[PDB]
Structures are given as C-alpha cells and as structure tokens.
Amino acid sequence: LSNEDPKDTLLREFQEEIARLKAQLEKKGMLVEDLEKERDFYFGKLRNIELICQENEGENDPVLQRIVDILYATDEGFV
Amino acid sequence: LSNEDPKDTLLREFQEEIARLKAQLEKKGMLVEDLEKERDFYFGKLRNIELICQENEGENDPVLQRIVDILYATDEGFVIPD
Ligand SMILES: [Mg+2]
C-alpha cells in the first residue's frame, strides 16, 4: 500500500492512461491506412477488369457477361 | 474563478479526456471493421471472377487471360486495356 496522496497517484495514472490511449489511437490509425490500401488494391483490380470487359464488348460475350454480373452485384455476386 | 482544488479540477478533466479518447478509439475500431468488410466484399468478387476464369481453363481465351493478369498483378494503378 502506497504512502502517496491518492490524488497524486491518480493524476499520474490518468496521464499514463491518456498517453496509452493516444498510442492505441495511433496504432489503430495505421491499421486503417493499411486496410484502405488493401481495399483500394482490390477495388482497383475490379475497375481494371471492368475496363477489360468494356473494351471487349462484354455485353456481346456470354462469359464476360457473368463477370459483369459480379462486378455490378450489390452482394458478392456468388452463383 | 472557482474555489476548487486544482487537483480536483484536473482529476475531473483528465477523466473527461480519457472518456473522449476511449470514444475516439471505439470509432476507429468501427472504421477498421467497416474497411475489413469492404475489403472482403471486393476480394470475394475477385475470387468469384477467378472461378469463372478457372472454369474456362483450356479455352486459351485471351480476354480471360488479361483478366487473370489483373487478378494476379502485384502493382497498384489503372491498366489501360488493349
Ligand atoms: Mg479489341
């Protein structure tokens, strides 16, 4: 059991908790940035595949139409 | 100005700051989960597309080959189709 004034104990502990929370926020911010990069990466692939379907008359090609259906599905387009 | 002990003032203000930071951390956690769901949504579409390319393996379809090239690309950015 400490001999310190409890108010002094808590002022120190609360400042340590504030610092810890700020550090956790920085860590979660970097996770967000990583996830934005991965999300952008996969969306960029979908966009590039859409451009291929557009260049190659996807609406006149039955296999490409099924890929187009996935591109524009509001769910994952699973069949 | 108040007659409050400055230590009592800071004990209250520090706990208010802790509560605000915990709320910010919850919000960032929600953003992480939103981004994971969006990323998984797009990955699932790409996986479904790859299965259609797999189904057509043996046809030598050059448009499907260009799609597979995108699926397995390592670089970011737009690819202008030919
Ligand atoms: Mg052409």
Tab-separated table of all heavy atoms in Angstrom, chain A residues 38-64:
chain	number	residue	atom	x	y	z
A	38	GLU	N	-5.316	-1.897	-48.885
A	38	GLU	CA	-5.772	-3.182	-49.398
A	38	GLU	C	-7.130	-3.049	-50.082
A	38	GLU	O	-7.350	-3.631	-51.150
A	38	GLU	CB	-5.829	-4.207	-48.267
A	38	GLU	CG	-6.002	-5.630	-48.747
A	38	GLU	CD	-5.785	-6.640	-47.645
A	38	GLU	OE1	-5.437	-6.226	-46.521
A	38	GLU	OE2	-5.977	-7.847	-47.898
A	39	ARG	N	-8.054	-2.294	-49.477
A	39	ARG	CA	-9.360	-2.055	-50.079
A	39	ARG	C	-9.211	-1.398	-51.449
A	39	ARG	O	-9.865	-1.803	-52.418
A	39	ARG	CB	-10.197	-1.184	-49.132
A	39	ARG	CG	-11.655	-0.911	-49.520
A	39	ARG	CD	-11.827	0.273	-50.472
A	39	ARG	NE	-10.995	1.437	-50.145
A	39	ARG	CZ	-11.349	2.421	-49.319
A	39	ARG	NH1	-12.516	2.394	-48.687
A	39	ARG	NH2	-10.522	3.441	-49.113
A	40	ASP	N	-8.351	-0.372	-51.539
A	40	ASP	CA	-8.095	0.295	-52.816
A	40	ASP	C	-7.493	-0.659	-53.838
A	40	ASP	O	-7.789	-0.564	-55.037
A	40	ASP	CB	-7.143	1.477	-52.619
A	40	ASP	CG	-7.778	2.637	-51.891
A	40	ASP	OD1	-9.002	2.620	-51.646
A	40	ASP	OD2	-7.037	3.593	-51.575
A	41	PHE	N	-6.595	-1.536	-53.385
A	41	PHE	CA	-5.942	-2.505	-54.261
A	41	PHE	C	-6.968	-3.419	-54.922
A	41	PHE	O	-6.963	-3.609	-56.149
A	41	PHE	CB	-4.942	-3.303	-53.420
A	41	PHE	CG	-4.093	-4.269	-54.189
A	41	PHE	CD1	-3.291	-3.841	-55.233
A	41	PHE	CD2	-4.035	-5.604	-53.810
A	41	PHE	CE1	-2.481	-4.733	-55.909
A	41	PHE	CE2	-3.224	-6.498	-54.489
A	41	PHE	CZ	-2.444	-6.062	-55.536
A	42	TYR	N	-7.879	-3.980	-54.122
A	42	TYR	CA	-8.862	-4.895	-54.686
A	42	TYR	C	-9.877	-4.152	-55.536
A	42	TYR	O	-10.288	-4.646	-56.595
A	42	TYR	CB	-9.561	-5.679	-53.575
A	42	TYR	CG	-8.642	-6.586	-52.800
A	42	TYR	CD1	-8.902	-6.884	-51.467
A	42	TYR	CD2	-7.519	-7.142	-53.386
A	42	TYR	CE1	-8.068	-7.713	-50.744
A	42	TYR	CE2	-6.673	-7.981	-52.661
A	42	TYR	CZ	-6.957	-8.256	-51.341
A	42	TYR	OH	-6.142	-9.078	-50.600
A	43	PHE	N	-10.300	-2.965	-55.102
A	43	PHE	CA	-11.227	-2.210	-55.936
A	43	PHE	C	-10.575	-1.822	-57.260
A	43	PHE	O	-11.223	-1.864	-58.314
A	43	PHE	CB	-11.740	-0.968	-55.210
A	43	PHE	CG	-12.802	-0.249	-55.982
A	43	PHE	CD1	-14.076	-0.783	-56.081
A	43	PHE	CD2	-12.517	0.921	-56.664
A	43	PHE	CE1	-15.065	-0.143	-56.817
A	43	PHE	CE2	-13.501	1.567	-57.401
A	43	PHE	CZ	-14.774	1.033	-57.479
A	44	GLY	N	-9.284	-1.475	-57.230
A	44	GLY	CA	-8.582	-1.156	-58.468
A	44	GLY	C	-8.560	-2.318	-59.445
A	44	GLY	O	-8.691	-2.122	-60.661
A	45	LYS	N	-8.414	-3.542	-58.931
A	45	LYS	CA	-8.489	-4.720	-59.795
A	45	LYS	C	-9.874	-4.856	-60.419
A	45	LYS	O	-10.006	-5.138	-61.619
A	45	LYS	CB	-8.142	-5.979	-59.004
A	45	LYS	CG	-6.686	-6.092	-58.583
A	45	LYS	CD	-6.462	-7.421	-57.875
A	45	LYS	CE	-5.050	-7.549	-57.327
A	45	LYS	NZ	-4.037	-7.383	-58.396
A	46	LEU	N	-10.926	-4.707	-59.608
A	46	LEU	CA	-12.279	-4.780	-60.152
A	46	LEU	C	-12.488	-3.734	-61.237
A	46	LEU	O	-13.091	-4.022	-62.279
A	46	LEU	CB	-13.314	-4.613	-59.035
A	46	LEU	CG	-13.411	-5.779	-58.037
A	46	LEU	CD1	-14.251	-5.382	-56.817
A	46	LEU	CD2	-13.987	-7.046	-58.677
A	47	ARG	N	-11.972	-2.516	-61.023
A	47	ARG	CA	-12.112	-1.471	-62.027
A	47	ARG	C	-11.362	-1.829	-63.302
A	47	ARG	O	-11.859	-1.597	-64.410
A	47	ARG	CB	-11.608	-0.137	-61.471
A	47	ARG	CG	-11.881	1.036	-62.384
A	47	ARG	CD	-13.305	1.539	-62.226
A	47	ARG	NE	-13.561	2.682	-63.094
A	47	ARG	CZ	-13.954	2.570	-64.356
A	47	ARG	NH1	-14.133	1.366	-64.882
A	47	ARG	NH2	-14.169	3.652	-65.094
A	48	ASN	N	-10.151	-2.374	-63.165
A	48	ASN	CA	-9.376	-2.753	-64.343
A	48	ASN	C	-10.039	-3.888	-65.099
A	48	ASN	O	-9.973	-3.930	-66.334
A	48	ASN	CB	-7.958	-3.140	-63.943
A	48	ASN	CG	-7.113	-1.934	-63.608
A	48	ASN	OD1	-7.368	-0.836	-64.105
A	48	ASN	ND2	-6.100	-2.125	-62.768
A	49	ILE	N	-10.701	-4.801	-64.381
A	49	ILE	CA	-11.438	-5.876	-65.032
A	49	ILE	C	-12.670	-5.322	-65.736
A	49	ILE	O	-13.017	-5.750	-66.844
A	49	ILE	CB	-11.783	-6.963	-63.992
A	49	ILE	CG1	-10.500	-7.704	-63.588
A	49	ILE	CG2	-12.869	-7.932	-64.504
A	49	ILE	CD1	-10.628	-8.517	-62.303
A	50	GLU	N	-13.343	-4.347	-65.119
A	50	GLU	CA	-14.450	-3.682	-65.797
A	50	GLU	C	-13.990	-3.048	-67.105
A	50	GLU	O	-14.680	-3.143	-68.128
A	50	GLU	CB	-15.070	-2.621	-64.883
A	50	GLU	CG	-16.253	-1.918	-65.526
A	50	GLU	CD	-16.837	-0.809	-64.663
A	50	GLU	OE1	-16.175	-0.370	-63.698
A	50	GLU	OE2	-17.969	-0.373	-64.963
A	51	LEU	N	-12.829	-2.387	-67.090
A	51	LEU	CA	-12.321	-1.759	-68.306
A	51	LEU	C	-12.038	-2.793	-69.390
A	51	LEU	O	-12.304	-2.545	-70.568
A	51	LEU	CB	-11.065	-0.943	-67.989
A	51	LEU	CG	-11.290	0.304	-67.125
A	51	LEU	CD1	-9.977	0.806	-66.563
A	51	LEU	CD2	-11.970	1.405	-67.915
A	52	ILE	N	-11.531	-3.971	-69.010
A	52	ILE	CA	-11.321	-5.047	-69.984
A	52	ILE	C	-12.652	-5.489	-70.578
A	52	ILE	O	-12.784	-5.670	-71.794
A	52	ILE	CB	-10.578	-6.232	-69.336
A	52	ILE	CG1	-9.121	-5.870	-69.069
A	52	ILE	CG2	-10.660	-7.493	-70.226
A	52	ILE	CD1	-8.468	-6.774	-68.032
A	53	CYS	N	-13.662	-5.677	-69.725
A	53	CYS	CA	-14.974	-6.074	-70.231
A	53	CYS	C	-15.555	-5.010	-71.155
A	53	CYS	O	-16.156	-5.331	-72.186
A	53	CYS	CB	-15.926	-6.350	-69.065
A	53	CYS	SG	-15.489	-7.837	-68.108
A	54	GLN	N	-15.367	-3.731	-70.810
A	54	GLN	CA	-15.855	-2.636	-71.641
A	54	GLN	C	-15.146	-2.595	-72.992
A	54	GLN	O	-15.781	-2.391	-74.031
A	54	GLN	CB	-15.659	-1.327	-70.876
A	54	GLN	CG	-16.235	-0.093	-71.516
A	54	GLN	CD	-16.023	1.128	-70.627
A	54	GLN	OE1	-15.844	1.000	-69.412
A	54	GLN	NE2	-16.026	2.308	-71.228
A	55	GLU	N	-13.822	-2.790	-72.998
A	55	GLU	CA	-13.047	-2.766	-74.237
A	55	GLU	C	-13.410	-3.927	-75.164
A	55	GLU	O	-13.335	-3.788	-76.392
A	55	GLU	CB	-11.552	-2.799	-73.894
A	55	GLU	CG	-10.606	-2.899	-75.098
A	55	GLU	CD	-10.469	-1.588	-75.870
A	55	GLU	OE1	-10.754	-0.519	-75.294
A	55	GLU	OE2	-10.074	-1.634	-77.054
A	56	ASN	N	-13.811	-5.068	-74.599
A	56	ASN	CA	-14.045	-6.301	-75.344
A	56	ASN	C	-15.526	-6.658	-75.428
A	56	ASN	O	-15.886	-7.839	-75.464
A	56	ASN	CB	-13.236	-7.434	-74.724
A	56	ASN	CG	-11.747	-7.198	-74.874
A	56	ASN	OD1	-11.205	-7.386	-75.960
A	56	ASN	ND2	-11.089	-6.744	-73.807
A	57	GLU	N	-16.390	-5.642	-75.476
A	57	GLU	CA	-17.814	-5.821	-75.778
A	57	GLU	C	-18.449	-6.865	-74.866
A	57	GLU	O	-19.127	-7.789	-75.323
A	57	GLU	CB	-18.024	-6.226	-77.234
A	57	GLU	CG	-17.371	-5.381	-78.280
A	57	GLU	CD	-17.675	-5.946	-79.647
A	57	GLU	OE1	-18.874	-5.972	-80.005
A	57	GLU	OE2	-16.737	-6.410	-80.337
A	58	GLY	N	-18.222	-6.711	-73.565
A	58	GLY	CA	-18.625	-7.738	-72.616
A	58	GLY	C	-20.080	-8.144	-72.745
A	58	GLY	O	-20.424	-9.309	-72.523
A	59	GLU	N	-20.948	-7.202	-73.116
A	59	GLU	CA	-22.368	-7.497	-73.255
A	59	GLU	C	-22.655	-8.427	-74.429
A	59	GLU	O	-23.737	-9.020	-74.485
A	59	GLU	CB	-23.155	-6.191	-73.407
A	59	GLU	CG	-22.944	-5.456	-74.735
A	59	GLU	CD	-21.547	-4.853	-74.911
A	59	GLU	OE1	-20.817	-4.652	-73.907
A	59	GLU	OE2	-21.183	-4.575	-76.074
A	60	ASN	N	-21.722	-8.560	-75.368
A	60	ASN	CA	-21.885	-9.460	-76.500
A	60	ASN	C	-21.105	-10.757	-76.328
A	60	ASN	O	-20.945	-11.498	-77.302
A	60	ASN	CB	-21.443	-8.778	-77.800
A	60	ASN	CG	-22.453	-7.764	-78.302
A	60	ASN	OD1	-23.660	-7.934	-78.138
A	60	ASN	ND2	-21.958	-6.703	-78.931
A	61	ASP	N	-20.614	-11.042	-75.126
A	61	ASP	CA	-19.768	-12.206	-74.865
A	61	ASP	C	-20.294	-12.904	-73.619
A	61	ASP	O	-20.110	-12.375	-72.500
A	61	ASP	CB	-18.313	-11.779	-74.686
A	61	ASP	CG	-17.351	-12.953	-74.632
A	61	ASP	OD1	-17.799	-14.095	-74.415
A	61	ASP	OD2	-16.136	-12.727	-74.817
A	62	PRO	N	-20.946	-14.061	-73.746
A	62	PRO	CA	-21.611	-14.673	-72.579
A	62	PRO	C	-20.727	-14.899	-71.353
A	62	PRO	O	-21.214	-14.727	-70.227
A	62	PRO	CB	-22.141	-15.994	-73.154
A	62	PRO	CG	-22.431	-15.664	-74.587
A	62	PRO	CD	-21.321	-14.727	-75.008
A	63	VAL	N	-19.453	-15.265	-71.518
A	63	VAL	CA	-18.596	-15.439	-70.343
A	63	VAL	C	-18.322	-14.103	-69.670
A	63	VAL	O	-18.331	-13.990	-68.436
A	63	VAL	CB	-17.289	-16.150	-70.725
A	63	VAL	CG1	-16.361	-16.224	-69.512
A	63	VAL	CG2	-17.586	-17.540	-71.258
A	64	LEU	N	-18.069	-13.066	-70.458
A	64	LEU	CA	-17.816	-11.769	-69.849
A	64	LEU	C	-19.061	-11.224	-69.164
A	64	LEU	O	-18.948	-10.487	-68.176
A	64	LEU	CB	-17.310	-10.785	-70.892
A	64	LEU	CG	-16.007	-11.199	-71.567
A	64	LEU	CD1	-15.539	-10.076	-72.479
A	64	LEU	CD2	-14.932	-11.562	-70.540
